[model samples]
Target chain A: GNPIVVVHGGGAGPISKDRKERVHQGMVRAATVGYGILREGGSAVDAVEGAVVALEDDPEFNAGCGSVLNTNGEVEMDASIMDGKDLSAGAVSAVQCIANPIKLARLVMEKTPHCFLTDQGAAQFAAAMGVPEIPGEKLVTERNKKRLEKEKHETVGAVALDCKGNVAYATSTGGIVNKMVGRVGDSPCLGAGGYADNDIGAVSTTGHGESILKVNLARLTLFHIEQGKTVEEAADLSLGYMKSRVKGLGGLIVVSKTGDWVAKWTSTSMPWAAAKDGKLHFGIDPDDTTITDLPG
Target chain B: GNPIVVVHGGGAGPISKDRKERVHQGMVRAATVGYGILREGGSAVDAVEGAVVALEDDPEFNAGCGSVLNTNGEVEMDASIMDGKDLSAGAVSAVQCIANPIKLARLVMEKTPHCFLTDQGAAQFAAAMGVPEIPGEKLVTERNKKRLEKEKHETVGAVALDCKGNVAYATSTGGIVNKMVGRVGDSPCLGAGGYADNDIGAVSTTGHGESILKVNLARLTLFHIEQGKTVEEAADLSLGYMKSRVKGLGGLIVVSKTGDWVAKWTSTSMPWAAAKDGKLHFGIDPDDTTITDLPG
Candidate 1:
């Protein structure tokens, strides 16, 4: 088995050179961080989580630290993590005052009997899991407090294939800038925000959440893979359908159990990076492409 | 074309006689309401939503009025609605008070730029949408205001196909009984709690949400249908896989665009009802069965 780590800043056109550089640097760092986990014989789950956590911590990204604001000018966030082994997943959405949502999402997977938790329930779960709460005020940055595209905004995510043939995917985002207060994007739902299945491939996506979800982007790509498309082809086909069917533009990263990978997005720019065979891959480019209680 | 609607109480094992009758009554009413809408030539979306709203208001069901309590003895609800004709959806989860979550979820689908909202964020969205709020305690039944088994508590959902050949699915729930503070099941999730695809079929499921979600019951069945299986056959295959692959127990109702339908469940019990061709279908039985803020 081989180890590969792919991470993205989920960006697109015309951002300041400074912002792009910063986002790219964070993507690179996240890739390394996750690849390091895989390199150390960690599970793909750990690799994806590590990379996503690293991305979430960077103020340059739209996750934990300096995420965009909602309509009321508050910082609400959503995140999800999926392990391809037993087909288990955890998600948290429209959460507030919580740092490291991917980490919290993992807790929902390992600690509770359910798959997704949101809002106050998520906050309650966080408390029960002993995951500390940070005030939302501390996380709001001037850039977000103030903010679109051709565009620099993006959801942060990662996908990894590990030494033992396991695969994992994760996503985190503050959501669309100035979104409704309770609005949630694709980052926290399985098969839309991200998906992982040891039997198929792992997929993490970013971009227009609603459009991405309409297609069940992650699962559709995996199904394409199962139907015999290559990882890249599967992603492209999925991405194309999103646009042709729902007019969605987005990006994705996918990895097969054997370590094959691709980063694709329909958005004009998606700052991305990957680590494999001890080398690194990073860019701002093209390509792209559920639930159970799925609601409350 | 014929119009058809199927609704369920999502029940399993039970000893309490009163609970059984009440839940059964709820099913009949929901079935009748949904059927009435369909008979009047309403869109499948309207039929499903109206049916689900009836269930949500009935305290006997595990949604809205008398839903089961979480560990904190407080009420948290999840709901969702999907229009298969356009793959459009709205969802709200871990939401506190505001009566019919399915109604709020409908608002999320129609009034907002995003598809899902959660917790206080959901409450905020509700406020902005001019949806009224009710104290959680007011909606709590002493039954929950009191405590479970094989167990009678269940998620509620509806699926429909209209005369126009359009399909829709909607679901609502109070989530797991006496479980964690933030436990969410498959009810609010697309393709888990339910799914609708005008070209394929419409599906709704209830039971062990975790297990159902692991296999993405609704979508998997639809995929099976796409690959050349009957609605019943697809649902059976999906249920079998859940058992063999993930040890899940569940139930599902599906309807094809031609008005073909099936009700199945792997669990010991499930109460369901449907209306089609101006006829009423009702029973407690088994059959079985993103994104895009893709969070903030």
Candidate 2:
């Protein structure tokens, strides 16, 4: 099959028209951006970042510009990006307002010896590395302003397989709505947020951060895939186990090293999209996805 | 053999009377503390925590009080604790002014849904959870006041196997000397700092945090042990891999679920101690160790 690239809009409620449309646009844009990179012969790492950057810029997603509010009415985002080629990764957690935290995550990978940086230190690194900081108020979109109470949450991520047979994974989240300060989710922690091995597969997870971490979701899924289970089979069994073991509700996008891929969720619905062989696939509800020519 | 318990003072320099004696006392004290808990029928988790607590309270080690100073001349600590029984873990990173980060790590495990908390958020959690915050200056010992330049570093940790055959791992570190603010090392990141699985083994790592993470040291070691290598063989090859693959220098303490253990280091020396069958082994030089009655 053609090089695979996929993105997800994480969890969903009874899909309302506004939420559904916004998610659909974000997912399609993300998949298109990612697939274009692969089509242009870019590395899977670049494709993963470009796709997630598209979602981060859209105020409809729970990352970067549109991140949900923390309990203090501020925006604290977590993000990670990994290169399957060398297993090099950079992550930023509990960081304040920064446009395109995905780029900052890449900066952390390129600039620092540490794979993960947090809060003030990450902010300091961002400034020194030239990652622009936006006003905190700019990140709490009008949609999140109504979040005076807890509600369903979402995380954005992507997995890509480039023509060179390499893979990459990236994830970013604003964390649960109105969560406490200093809380870090699965998005910035390796193996929990995602894992990529050229010999195995690449995975990007979106879910209950704590529950995702407890099960080491990404690596566990990759483990099954490497053990001869089909990518789809591994994704299903892994999500099932997370729910049965930790009662976590979430979803993930997986791409095997051989280029096979799947977008699976335990939740009722997740707005997801993928592209391969010039065909773009999109969906919201479980088990029902749409296929068409790649967008533009 | 009696339930195996081991603790380490991390990296060491050319043997000095002052450094050697301090490390020796600290290692013995940590081992004694951990072994006592195992002998008393405490769970492996409890023993691991108890041992690290002693080292953290000891100024000779790079954790808790007397931790090395950051570039800003302040104390920022990171720590982690894990129980193999259910794979539950708690971690704190880039936290400031807590007397014992290990206790707060336990608090995160018991109280929060998150396995890891960072920076200001972690400090906020510490206050809310009743872990008293001390003056940051108190954490910077006079010994660290001399830290005017980069130098060799250390992290303290423990791994233990209880009478019931359960296992646990814990690690705490002040990180490298003159490190940047908001920097975190391997000690607080799961699988990087440490990993514990009752059916497999437990491991606690002390090294260049970034290097340890680059290689996924703790879990990688346990993976080899589970693959049927002796605990000692696995530790040697694992540390060797970190050295050859990443040019990283470090050491680790490991305990198999079956009550076997090893303390191995690629660094010139690591002050280490272990206890089993009422014999306490302590040393600060590579391949040279002493055995004595357990300190009563």
Best by lDDT: 2
- Candidate 1 lDDT tens digits, A78-155: 998988889898988878887899998999898877788777778877887788888888888877765732123458
The parts of candidate 1 lying over 4 Å away from their true place are: A148-154, A286-296, B14-22, B145-154, B286-296
Please give the TM-score that candidate 2 achieves against the real structure.
0.92
Q: Residue A88: error of model 2 in Å?
A: 1.7
Q: Pick out the ten consecutive residues of candidate 2 chain A with the lowest summed lDDT.
A: A145-154
Candidate 2: clashing pairs of residues: A182-B121
Error of 2 at A240 (Å): 3.6
lDDT of 2 by residue, A118-204 (tens): 999999888888777789988888778776354533389999989889889999988888777888888987787898778788999
* CAPRI accuracy category, model 1: medium
lDDT of 1 by residue, B184-232 (tens): 6777777777888888888988878788777778888888888888888
lDDT of 2 by residue, B84-176 (tens): 877788999998988899989999999976788899989888888778868998888887878634343338999988888788999999998
- Every prediction's TM-score for the first chain? 0.92, 0.96
